[PDB]
Structures are given as structure tokens and as C-alpha cells.
Amino acid sequence: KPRLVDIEQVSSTHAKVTLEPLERGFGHTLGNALRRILLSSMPGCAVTEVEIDGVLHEYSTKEGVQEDILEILLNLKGLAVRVQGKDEVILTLNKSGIGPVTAADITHDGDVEIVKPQHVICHLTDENASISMRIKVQRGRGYVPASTRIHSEEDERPIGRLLVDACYSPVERIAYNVEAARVEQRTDLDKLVIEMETNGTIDPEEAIRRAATILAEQLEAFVDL
Amino acid sequence: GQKVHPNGIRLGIVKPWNSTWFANTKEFADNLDSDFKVRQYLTKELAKASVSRIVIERPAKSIRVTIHTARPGIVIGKKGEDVEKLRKVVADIAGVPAQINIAEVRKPELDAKLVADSITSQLERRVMFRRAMKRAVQNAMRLGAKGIKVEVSGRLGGAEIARTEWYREGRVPLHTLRADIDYNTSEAHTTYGVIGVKVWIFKGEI
Amino acid sequence: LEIEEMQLKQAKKDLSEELQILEAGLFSRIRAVLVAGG
Amino acid sequence: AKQSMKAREVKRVALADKYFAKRAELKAIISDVNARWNAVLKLQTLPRDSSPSRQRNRCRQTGRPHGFLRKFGLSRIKVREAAMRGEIPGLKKASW
Amino acid sequence: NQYYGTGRRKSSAARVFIKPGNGKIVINQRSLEQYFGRETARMVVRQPLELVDMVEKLDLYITVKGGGISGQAGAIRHGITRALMEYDESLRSELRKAGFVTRDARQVERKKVGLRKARRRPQFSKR
Amino acid sequence: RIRIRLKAFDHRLIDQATAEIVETAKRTGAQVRGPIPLPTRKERFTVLISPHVNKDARDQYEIRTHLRLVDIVEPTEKTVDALMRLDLAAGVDVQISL
RNA sequence: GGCUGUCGUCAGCUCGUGUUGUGAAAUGUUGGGUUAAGUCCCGCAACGAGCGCAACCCUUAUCCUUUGUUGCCAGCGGUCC
């Protein structure tokens, strides 16, 4: 079996994990299976519901903002968030004045972690102009669009609550590379090096461990039949 | 009399309070008071607004107030008419920055309040109690629901001998706390007497 | 009426914005010369 | 409850404030061991309705003075209704 | 080592600690004879003890504080009997036979509106 | 050490309102000695049901005032300044005295 | 009108359909056991259903998980005990 070690951490987002001792056919197999798991099945947190002040629907324009409500909703999807203890958390963006909204600006409460202080949400282009939107975050498995979310709602009077396409996937890109190695007493052994890029809401060591656990639960039923 | 309030009896489970907030003996005294003034008034200028309930949240010197209504648009105003007025009327009435969020009533035929305020209004329109009481209320059974018990007080029609009426569909086991029912009253001061009415809508079980 | 009220408020805002840029700027410029001279 | 009655109380409040509530305090000093000037004791009679003891509460909703409870300021049945209608925060039947 | 035994009855709280040896008994810095001794019938506390040869057997360090004599004495009996069961989990039958292993669920009663004392209904000689 | 108190009318709110602190108000900076329940202040009332007469009527009500302590046992700045960022709860008295 | 007491916490009160009599009406719901109870089990020209009774609510009677301030002190220690 392989021993997981040697974590070459490049940045907060990017990383390069390696698994040195692997059999002749164990380089491609696990790596390709993990690639299929990591991209498809990856638990995470992202924006779902948003309610903006002085805005009844999307496809309108707010006073004192150059970026439209439809354009803001798209920027909200790109914003990275990671929740430790809480399942769902509602943040509030209290800010005003001439200039760009850095990225944080929200009141820091509970277990909500923020990894983006530069990520642009919107630009304020007037003195008295003000914005105060309550943003909701939800936990899930995969990609859930806005079209699916209006079916089994049952009474959704909040018209201000403009819906967004949810994206519960931490990985941005994945790439494995198998290279030959000569360990302490060996003939022909592959070295699986898994290069992984993330949004920054979950660790690479934590993501790869959770991905392998999902495959074990699936393989558990296949033994006894 | 010999019946427990089918709503208060359940105020603990399966039934939320139409006014949830904290307060101490000090302000509590005048607190529930203002809530009455504001709530009583919100109906005066919004009777035909077809308003159901009227919750009242209270964090700290800023009550929320939610006017549930089958007719939201009319309770909205000319893109600011209604809202502004009310939202402002809550001025000295509570002496605090009081907001106001409207809630849309889904299927106004299953909500007690409405089904009650309606039948009573029809009565005031010179209409046979039996007809409306039965049919004009029977609808609550077509849009779904399982059981609806109506009740019209006495003095119905030309008569000095007040009489109560029955008429009920499905099942209304008001003897079950885990039953959850939509009960509400409604008067109708007509040419003579005050023909009352009570709506008992059994919206599913647990 | 709500639309025409909003259209009237926006019309008063747009034309007043012209009178505040030009007419405030012109009024302060004429007044500044009068203070220097007098 | 009457309309006239439900009015007097209202005033009995005002006067019992603009004066006694803060002014009686003054004579309360002399008319007490604070070393009891007769004049001060006599001056005590300037008003009448101006007294914190001349108030019988009365239902804050209707007016019925019988069945008051500083908590809700209401009178029996009023508390009864408001309670069942949930109009009163956190308050349901009591059983134990 | 030691063996704990809660035990209680009628708003009471018993806390007896059975140690191997030392037939001495103390309840809240007091003697089982100086706190209870010479009472109504506080011979119940040391009842389960002697029930199986004590004194020169083990020790009893109690800490009760709930309910009056009768009850406060009943709680201990429950804690003790419960306790011994620890030192030997094969003597339950014996203690149960007497009825110590079980607690006196029979608590006080709550008064009731209309009545005058939860049960004592007001008289009406003329009806 | 700053002490915090939460007294609501039920767990439906006193719960989330408290867990919030332990979660948010307590990350690494704040110490937090622990969330305690504390005795509940029970205040019931008896009201005559029938209007006039029928003494044998009466109805009993009650308002349970649920409370919680917890309190943070670490007066820092980075974590002791992330609590104000929480003022929701339509009914959760939070006496933040020291 | 709204609200309350009372028979009475009594086990009672009915409906649909079917069948029976010219009809009011009956049957069901009576009978045999049984239960706190129109509770249940057989029977039976009735087959099913609703309001009830029961059960959901609280509270008290054991233990478990969890948190440990103003509550606790089993051990160890220091005692202005």
C-alpha cells in the first residue's frame, strides 16, 4: 500500500501532494479514479440566496453603482467562503463611501471564515450612496442552478431574495502525473504526484482524504454480494 | 361554553406566536400595549387589503411587523404608497424605528382569518348564510386541505331566536394537539345582532 | 400615477443636477470676483 | 368602563406627576425628620387629585379595574384573549 | 476502592460512599445518632447495612440534604442499598426483596383550582 | 473577563443565539469557560375564565424565561471585537455586562 | 356576539351507502364476552366514515450524552476551618 506524505504547498490556493510507493498499475488507476471523484463529488460551501436593499428584482439598476444587479450576482458566485461548525450562515455587507468594496467589509461573527480580502463585489461611485445586502450561504455536494431551486419551494413571498446558481465545488482544477522512482530496494515503481488547485475554502490534505473516503464507501458494497 | 381555544392550546407546539419578542415587567406593560394600537390600526386602513395575520418581531427599539395578506400588491401601494404610510405611521405609536415586511398568503381559501372575514362580509352584503357558509367556504376543500369546520352564530335571517349552524367537511380533530388547525373568528354587525362565525381548517396532521 | 410621480421626481433631479454643476459654479465664480474687488 | 371614568385616571396621572412625582419630594423633606413645619404640612393640601394613591390602574385595553396585572396591564378576559391569540409574547397554558 | 450510590426520595438527595472497612457513619459532619439518632425511626438508614452484617464490615460517609427526616432518611437508604450493589453486583435479588432497590416514586401532590387542598373539596352542607 | 448572559423565552431562539457565541465569539482568541443552562425563572398566573361569577373557573398560564451564561474568559481584542457583529434574534436579551 | 357554569371525563353523539316499513322510523349503534371507555374480540343485513374515548402536550418517577457560573466538592493539595 502507499504512504501519503511530502506536501509541497505552493500557495494558499495551489498545492502539490505526492504518494511515492505505488505498484506498476497503481499510478494511473487510483489517480484517474480520484480525478473522477475530486471533480464530480467535492463537498463545499457557496452563495445560494441573496436579498438586496432597494431592489425588487434582478435586471434593474441601483442608485450609485456602475455594476448592474445581474453582474453583482455573478461576482457573488466567485466569492469564496468556508464554514466550520454552522451548516448555514447569513452574512450582512454594511459599507458606504466613495471607492471599491475590498472583499471582507462584512461583520465577522460565528464560525464564518473569509479567504478573500481583494475580490471585488461592487464599486461605489457617489458620496451619499449606500448598500446593505443580507447574503445567505448553504452547504451541499454539487452544482445546483437557479432554475432547479424554484420547484419544491412552497410559498416564496420574499421577492427581494434574488436567487443565484449555487456552486458547491472547492476544486478549480485537478492534474495527476505518474513518474518512475527508485526507492530503498525496488525494481519498477510509479510515483503518483497529484497537483491540485482550490478556491481556498478547504485544505488539499483534507480534500484528498475526504475524496478517498467517498470511494471506500462505494467499494464497501461491492465486496459482499 | 365548553371548548378550549384550538389555537392557544397549541401555542406551544406546531403553532408560532404572532408576536415573538422579549421584555421585562418594566416596558412589557406598555409594550404589548403599543403592539395593540399598531396592530389594530394596520387593519383600519387595510381592511379590504385582505390581510391574514400580523406578526411583530422586536430586536431592540426596532419592531419588524409582518402583514400577511392574500392581496400583497394592494398592501404595497403605488410603488411606495401603502408601505411608506404604514412604515411611517409606526412613528410615535412605538417611538422607535419600526419597519414592515409584507408576506404573501398562499391559497387565501385555506387561511382561517380570510375565510372568516369573507363569509361575514358576504352576510353584510345581504346574502343567504347557508349558501356562502357552505359553498363560498367549501372551496377550502378544493384547493386541498383535509377537513374544515365552519360555524355561524345566531340571529341568521329574519328571526329573533338566535341559532347556530354546523356544516363541516373532511375531519377536524381539534382534540389532537399534533393536529394543527387554522382557527379564527369574525363578526358581522348587521341590521340586527352580530352574527358571528368561526373557521376551523384542518391543514394536514402533525 | 406612481410611474408619472417617479418620472416627475427624476425629471426634477436631472434638471437640478444641471443647475448645480453649471448656477452654483457660475454663482460662486461671480461672487468670488465681487469679494476680491469690493 | 365609561368614557368619563376612563378619562379622569388619565389626568390623575399628569397632575400626580407635574407636581407630587417631583414636587411632593420637597415637602416630604420638611414633613419628615430631616433635622415638620406646619406650613409645609398645610401646603401639602394645595392639590388633591395630585396623588400616586388616587390611581386604580384600570384595564389598559378596556378599563375594567378588576383583574389587573402590571405584567400585561390588562384585565382577566383581556389577558385571556390576547394570550390565546398569541398577541402576548411567550405565554401558553400552564400545567404541572 | 469506593462505591458511590445516589439514592433519593420525596425531594431528597442522598450521597453515601461505601469504603472497605470502618463501620463509622457520618452524615454532613454529624453522627447517624447525632443527626438522626433518637428520632421517629431513623433505623432505616442502617437497615440495609445490618441487613447483611455490617459495622465491622465497611464504611459509610454520607452527604444528604433534601426533604424532612422521613424522606432524608429514605433517600440515604436508597443510596446505600444502591451502593452495596456496586461492591457486589450479585446481591440485587436480596435488596430488591425488601424493596430498597426501588425508589419511592410516591411524591407530594399539587393543589388544584376549585379545591382547597389538591383533593379536599369544599363542603356544601346544603345542596 | 467579559461575562455574557442570554435570557430568551425558549430554546427555539436561545439555542442558535448561544451556539453563535461559542462558534463566532469563540474561535481561538476568546477562551470561553463553557455554556451553562442556569435555573429557569418560572412565572405562572391564574386568571378567572368566565366574565363575572363562577369562581370555580380560573385558567393557569405561565412564561418560562430561559437563560444561558457561557461568558468569554479571555479579554483580548481580535476575538472580543467580533461579537458586536451579532444583533439579530427577535427576542434574546443579551446583558453584556462585566 | 363574545365569553362561563352543568349533566360530565359521562361515553356517549351522528353521517354516507345498503337494506327494512305505506310512513314517522329502524338498522349501523342491538346481542355474547371485555375494558376507564361505542376499548377490544366474536356475532350479526349491514359495510364503512366523522365528533368523541385512547395517543400527541406538560409535569413527576430511573439512568445516559453534553456544559459547569453565582451551583458541586470524590481525590490531591493550602487553610485568615
Curated annotation (Swiss-Prot), chain C:
Detail the disulphide connectivity of this chain as listed in its UniProt entry.
Answer: none
Leader sequence segment: none
Query: What domain of life?
Result: Bacteria
Summary of subunit composition and partner proteins: The RNAP catalytic core consists of 2 alpha, 1 beta, 1 beta' and 1 omega subunit. When a sigma factor is associated with the core the holoenzyme is formed, which can initiate transcription.
User: Of which family is this protein a member?
Assistant: Belongs to the RNA polymerase beta chain family.
Briefly, what is this protein's role? DNA-dependent RNA polymerase catalyzes the transcription of DNA into RNA using the four ribonucleoside triphosphates as substrates.
Q: What is this protein called?
A: DNA-directed RNA polymerase subunit beta
What organism is the protein native to? Escherichia coli (strain K12 / DH10B)
From Swiss-Prot, chain D:
Task: Give the UniProt record's GO annotations in the biological process aspect.
Answer: cytoplasmic translation; ribosomal small subunit assembly; translation
| Source superkingdom | Bacteria
**UniProt-listed InterPro entries:** Ribosomal_uS14, Ribosomal_uS14_bac/plastid, Ribosomal_uS14_CS
The record's GO molecular-function terms, alphabetically, read: rRNA binding; structural constituent of ribosome; tRNA binding
> Keywords assigned by UniProt?
Ribonucleoprotein, Ribosomal protein
- List the record's Gene Ontology CC terms alphabetically: cytoplasm; cytosolic small ribosomal subunit; small ribosomal subunit
Q: Which Pfam families match?
A: Ribosomal_S14 (PF00253)
Q: What does this protein do?
A: Binds 16S rRNA, required for the assembly of 30S particles and may also be responsible for determining the conformation of the 16S rRNA at the A site.
Q: How does it assemble?
A: Part of the 30S ribosomal subunit. Contacts proteins S3 and S10.
Query: Which protein family is it in?
Result: Belongs to the universal ribosomal protein uS14 family.
**Name of this protein:** Small ribosomal subunit protein uS14
Which source organism? Escherichia coli (strain K12)
The gene for this chain is rpsN
Curated annotation (Swiss-Prot), chain E:
Q: Which Gene3D superfamilies match?
A: 3.30.230.10
Q: Which GO terms describe its cellular component?
A: cytoplasm; cytosol; cytosolic small ribosomal subunit
| Keyword tags | Ribonucleoprotein, Ribosomal protein, RNA-binding, tRNA-binding
Which Pfam families does the record cross-reference, listed alphabetically? Ribosomal_S9
**InterPro entries referenced in this protein's UniProt entry, alphabetically:** Ribosomal_Su5_D2-typ_SF, Ribosomal_uS9, Ribosomal_uS9_bac/plastid, Ribosomal_uS9_CS, Ribsml_uS5_D2-typ_fold_subgr
Q: Which GO terms describe its molecular function?
A: RNA binding; structural constituent of ribosome; tRNA binding
Give the GO terms filed under biological process for this record. Answer: cytoplasmic translation
The family annotation for this protein states:
Belongs to the universal ribosomal protein uS9 family.
Q: What does this protein do?
A: The C-terminal tail plays a role in the affinity of the 30S P site for different tRNAs. Mutations that decrease this affinity are suppressed in the 70S ribosome.
Q: Whom does it interact with, and what assembly results?
A: Part of the 30S ribosomal subunit. Contacts 16S rRNA. Cross-links to the P site tRNA and weakly to the A site tRNA.
Q: Provide the protein name.
A: Small ribosomal subunit protein uS9
Please report the organism this UniProt entry assigns to the protein: Escherichia coli (strain K12)
From the broadest rank down, the organism's phylogenetic lineage runs:
Bacteria, Pseudomonadati, Pseudomonadota, Gammaproteobacteria, Enterobacterales
UniProtKB/Swiss-Prot annotation, chain F:
Could you identify this protein by its name? Small ribosomal subunit protein uS10
Describe its function: Involved in the binding of tRNA to the ribosomes. Part of the processive rRNA transcription and antitermination complex (rrnTAC). The complex forms an RNA-chaperone ring around the RNA exit tunnel of RNA polymerase (RNAP). It supports rapid transcription and antitermination of rRNA operons, cotranscriptional rRNA folding, and annealing of distal rRNA regions to allow correct ribosome biogenesis. In complex with NusB is involved in the regulation of ribosomal RNA (rRNA) biosynthesis by transcriptional antitermination.
Assembly, in brief, is: Part of the 30S ribosomal subunit. Can also form a heterodimer with the transcription antitermination protein NusB. Binding of S10 to NusB is mutually exclusive with its incorporation into the ribosome. The rRNA transcription and antitermination complex (rrnTAC) consists of RNAP, NusA, NusB, NusE (this protein), NusG, SubB, ribosomal protein S4, DNA and precursor rRNA; S4 is more flexible than other subunits.
Cross-referenced HAMAP family: Ribosomal_uS10
Disulfide bonds, which pairs? none
**Pfam families listed in its UniProt record:** Ribosomal_S10
- BP terms from Gene Ontology: cytoplasmic translation; regulation of DNA-templated transcription elongation; ribosome biogenesis; transcription antitermination
Q: Name one GO cellular component term.
A: cytosol
Tell me if Cell membrane is a UniProt keyword of this record. Answer: no
Q: Which family does it belong to?
A: Belongs to the universal ribosomal protein uS10 family.
Indicate whether Isomerase appears among the record's keywords: no
Q: Which organism is it from?
A: Escherichia coli (strain K12)
The domain of life is Bacteria
